[PDB]
Copies of this chain bind each other. A is one copy, B any other.
Amino acid sequence: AKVIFVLAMDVSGKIASSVESWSSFEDRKNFRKITTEIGNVVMGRITFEEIGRPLPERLNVVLTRRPKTSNNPSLVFFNGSPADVVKFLEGKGYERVAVIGGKTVFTEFLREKLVDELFVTVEPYVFGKGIPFFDEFEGYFPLKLLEMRRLNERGTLFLKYSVEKSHR
């Protein structure tokens, strides 16, 4: 299955901050369509407490170390590596996996080189403080810009990148 990062950030690369309502209406609308279309969302425990409740109409997979459980079929706490979650999801029939968040989970997938496309929304702000997209990993990923749409008049931008992979 192909792994797709879906995230929103400011111009400086932060995926979260203290600013109020920096996420635009169009960005949220776009996120819902894309993630419900993919059918599942993979997030970290930090991101999951942030959102509060499982995202409707999608299988929510929360990565964590402590064996936890939920009495909601659409919510799953999964103790395992990035490689294992993808495999768990393909066993559910998903051919695409959407990783939506956590500096931690993003870092974990990047380190493991499990990422095929990045769906990035850039909100028109520069946050002096916030949580970075990821920590740090060895190397870098070359990308190719597949699409770019302006979502509203102020300037929220949606960008779709594929990771350039060397092939035969």
Interface residues of A (CB under 8 A from B): 10-14, 17, 19, 110, 118, 120, 124-129, 132-134, 136-146, 148, 150, 154-155, 157, 159, 161
Contacts and interface: CB of A to CB of B under 8 A. Distances in A.
A14 B133 CA distance: 11
Chain copies in the assembled complex: 2
A129 B10 CA distance: 19
Nearest to A129: B136
A141 B127 CA distance: 7
Contacts of A13: 11-14, 132-133
A142 B11 CA distance: 10
A111 B146 CA distance: 36
B110 A118 contact: no
A142 to B, nearest CB: 6
A5 B155 CA distance: 18
Contacts of A133: 11-13
A124 B110 contact: no
